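Deviations from the work plan: none for this task. Representative record:
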Amino acid sequence: GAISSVLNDILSRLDKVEAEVQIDRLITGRLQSLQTYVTQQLIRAAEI
Amino acid sequence: CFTNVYADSFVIRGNEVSQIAPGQTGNIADYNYKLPDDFTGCVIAWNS
């Protein structure tokens, strides 16, 4: 839901207030991709 | 209740008043009066 997936693109094109929330989306999304990976790994580790 | 309190006073050409608020960029906010992206308080402006 951000304007871009490239972090310095956002920081160059947008002002500190707007740029921050765009990065937040990327932080919230990426941190979801890690929790998904680690949950999938903890389940896959149990069958191993 | 407030722990320390300051009133800052100054005179602005109206079309730049949109630079007093946090983090924004432009002459007043870069060379005359910058307030931090992490401050609590209010901005009052009126014609004179």
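The first helix of chain B runs from residue 27 to 32.
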